Amino acid sequence: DVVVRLPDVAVPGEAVQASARQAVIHLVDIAGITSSTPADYATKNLYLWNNETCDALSAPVADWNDVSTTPTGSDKYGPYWVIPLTKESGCINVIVRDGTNKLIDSDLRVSFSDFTDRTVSVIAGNSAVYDSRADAFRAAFGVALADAHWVDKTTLLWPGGENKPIVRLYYSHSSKVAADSNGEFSDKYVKLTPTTVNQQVSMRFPHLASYPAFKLPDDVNVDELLQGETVAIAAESDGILSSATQVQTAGVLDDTYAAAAEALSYGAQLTDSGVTFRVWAPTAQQVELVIYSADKKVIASHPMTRDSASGAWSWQGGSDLKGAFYRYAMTVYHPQSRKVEQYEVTDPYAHSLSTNSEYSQVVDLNDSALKPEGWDGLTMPHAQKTKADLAKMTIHESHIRDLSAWDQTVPAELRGKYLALTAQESNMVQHLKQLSASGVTHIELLPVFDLATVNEFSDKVADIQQPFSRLCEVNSAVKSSEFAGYCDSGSTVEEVLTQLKQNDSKDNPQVQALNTLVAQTDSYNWGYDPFHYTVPEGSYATDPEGTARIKEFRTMIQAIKQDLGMNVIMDVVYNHTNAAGPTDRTSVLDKIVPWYYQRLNETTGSVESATCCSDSAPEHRMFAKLIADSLAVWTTDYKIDGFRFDLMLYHPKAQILSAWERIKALNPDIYFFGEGWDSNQSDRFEIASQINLKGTGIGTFSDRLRDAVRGGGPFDSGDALRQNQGVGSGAGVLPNELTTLSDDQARHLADLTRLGMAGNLADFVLIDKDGAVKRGSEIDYNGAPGGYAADPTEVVNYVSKHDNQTLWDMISYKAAQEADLDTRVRMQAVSLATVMLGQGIAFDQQGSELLRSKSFTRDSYDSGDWFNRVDYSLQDNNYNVGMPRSSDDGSNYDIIARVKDAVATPGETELKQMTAFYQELTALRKSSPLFTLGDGATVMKRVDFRNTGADQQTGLLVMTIDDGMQAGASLDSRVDGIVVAINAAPESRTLQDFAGTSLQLSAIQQAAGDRSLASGVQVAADGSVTLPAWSVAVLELPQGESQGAGLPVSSK
Ligand SMILES: OC[C@H]1O[C@H](O[C@H]2[C@H](O)[C@@H](O)[C@@H](O[C@H]3[C@H](O)[C@@H](O)[C@@H](O)O[C@@H]3CO)O[C@@H]2CO)[C@H](O)[C@@H](O)[C@@H]1O
Ligand SMILES: OC[C@H]1O[C@H](O[C@H]2[C@H](O)[C@@H](O)[C@@H](O[C@H]3[C@H](O)[C@@H](O)[C@@H](O)O[C@@H]3CO)O[C@@H]2CO)[C@H](O)[C@@H](O)[C@@H]1O
Ligand SMILES: OC[C@H]1O[C@H](O[C@H]2[C@H](O)[C@@H](O)[C@@H](O)O[C@@H]2CO)[C@H](O)[C@@H](O)[C@@H]1O
Ligand SMILES: [Ca+2]
Ligand SMILES: [Ca+2]
């Protein structure tokens, strides 16, 4: 059949041949595809220079600003330059340009050794030298991009194949398809024939459903084609190639191997009677198991056995391999580099690792030696079975270093370690113990799986508590910086940072200047950089070499549950990997099965980075299985109680639900929740968003109450940070000098806050700012329906988290100049009360109870111990410790300088006051089942609000919870109802709604005396209740001999 080959038809000839002592360079202008008039090549020149490697040029060009080296002549195929030479031997340096812009990105070096005639031709941005314009012309018809998609055994979707009479799929086992010396495409191929995309493919990949489809013969040996490179090619009737592109094969890989591969188990599976290693690598040509000694010397290399049906490789050995280190030697084709790579990779299913994750290790997590005393009997301190149980969840989001890096009462060797949680006599542990006794029920841990952004080899790291001399020894950027003079000083880094504070300002942000360098080689990072999904992080262990970290992690889990009495939630990041490609140190998955575990751009094949990094593909079957298998280990072997899915929105709704079904078989009470924002992936599959997860039981963080109370949004910059006041900072009622918020806008935020305190349900009914009856879904939130949930347990309310500015820093940006320090502390408590006293699950950042500040830093992931400091000795809240990182907050320096010093920085008196307020709120939350009803229908039958409508007193939130006869059964034997009143305003407010009812202040607040958030509250004889400025009161209707009238929800 017709032999497809490069365009040899109207191929450009040679304009001229170099004469004696001279070389000519052609600039093939592909625009000659039509040529109907002489183009202008006047503003086109070359940059010549003869130096070391090449010095044949005779009298080259002076400065780069020289544009006189114009064409010697030109024709329909482009211009050409006649360059003088001193000798016809050697080589010359050239740079084709167009005025001053590098027409080509490379220092082309024409050697007279490779091109004797010294006559070559180049192309616009091709970085290559040809011996003729003919070769270059055809060079523009090579393989480009990767917009071809092999989605199943017999289907290929590719745009460039429409019309083209000749559509084929070429392939080469160990080579890169292109064109032989004769400019032809010899390699074998499979003829493609136009067809209509089946219903199976359209459903699997909706975003490609409109692509021109092609059919493959049934007798095609798919397995063999997938062993090397495959390229889609199109050609006209005569057989001339128009385009050639690479192929994305994730689709056919699943269609061919997934089912069989899903049925197997992976990793180094050790029993006490032997071991079986298995890794999935359907496209690899060879895979060998390399065993290493403790000192990392190769003990043996075993070729593995491939299973044809699954594409998995295995090797079985004896129990003596327990504890051995290993890697998989891969021989596989990687589309990004277009070559059969050869490299050793760690196990994606690794369960143990060597220092810095260089080698995986064989381990049996069931081994008693890897478990603390009594581990198997560890029980969950808090119930998570019923919705009522779940609603009591009150989360404290913490970080391993944030907890103990600064605590001098924690043994030095345990600071920043998992084991710090076992130091019962430390300030930090005693603080957490008290928070637990007061109502905090869960500890959520930032990344404790194997992250990549912290070097686990201690000698390569330097922290601020150590000598500056150590920093200089491990960080070359510091040694070559303006801070180099501190290298041979006798100061520690923190001592230097402290002295830099006085002269630090928006005009001289020297604190962050030095810290930015320190961040490169310290032990700090949030860790949203996945290296291995199912192994604990090593830097948080006292010994990162081998299995040691496993028992230490468990010892920590046991301490939290058994000694501190709190459940544990793990932050997981399956939405992306730290890196991809065949060369990065941390690329594991993309090295073993290239282009399968990552989500790629439909046209270029490039790994997407919408998540921040290397986007993963949870929609692919084997990655979905890896996720579920990983969660199974954390659940069963590490006894985790719940999981917070980072960017859950990038996962298909179906995948998250399937995972939950799997895990519920191991732990029936496991709880799943995560970020359900808009991932922009709806064109590929139904995403796991707030809206789509309604009624599923999967929770999502709610941004409704969060923004209404904090004010503004996470994207605000400049003056907007101060202008956008929230309910918690006096929107409307206590305006600052810049805001333009209307009373109507302030009342809209209150509508969102009330709805949130009722669980942000789509069907909850309330009276809005204008007196209109509205369902939660009818209250607008930046253009979208406000209420979205079916049950309050599907909503996670919060006013502070590791992301964005802390609650205190937001209040500092927004508070009116006249709001004093005491008032700001109460604003922090008032803000937190909307969350703690609400029906949705309560979530909060470690340190809110201590007015935690990050010195205004918005995104502190790599801002180290300095900006993320939490002082459990209670001296201050880390506010005003230097301007934040300029790269991300520099645009906010002006507003920061204007508001920063309004009032004094909180000290011990303020921190103790806040901790008291905080523990009062959490204690109130668990004092009655009425605060955590759990079921949506029950919330609607019992919860209501007062002080609503157009005649409302702005800033006063009044919520009622019925336990009376009209609500149904009495759920609390001590009360017939409860009233929550939050007076977020500078005036005293009087409530007349309950005159003649017999309300009483909660015993918990009464017991706090003048230290209560309700201090000064008065319950009059006539039943009227008066609340002081910025106060919170919980009142109850004491129950008598039998259930009383209560506080029935008003029909609307
Ligand atoms: O060099 C890698 C990567 O680093 C930076 O990205 C980090 C973000 O700055 C940081 O905020 C964090 O983002 C995560 C959120 O904290 C989390 O709540 C959720 O929203 O997922 C986010 C992504 O996982 O972590 C990332 C990754 O370390 C930097 O901004 C990137 O440009 C850079 O590529
Ligand atoms: O992914 C990298 C990115 O991570 C961090 O950004 C996160 C925000 O901090 C976080 O608030 C969230 O943003 C969502 C809003 O909360 C929500 O109201 C709505 O607007 O959707 C937003 C997401 O589209 O998630 C992002 C995740 O990116 C970090 O702060 C960034 O610096 C970093 O670039
Ligand atoms: O000095 C010769 C120098 O020329 C080239 O560098 C250019 C560079 O590409 C321009 O962007 C700009 O910076 O001017 C430079 C020369 O002035 C070569 O890349 C370089 O190897 C060579 O030494
Ligand atoms: Ca030539
Ligand atoms: Ca690590």
Ligand SMILES: [Ca+2]
């Ligand atoms: Ca760091």
Ligand SMILES: [Ca+2]
């Ligand atoms: Ca997309």
Ligand SMILES: [Ca+2]
């Ligand atoms: Ca009752």
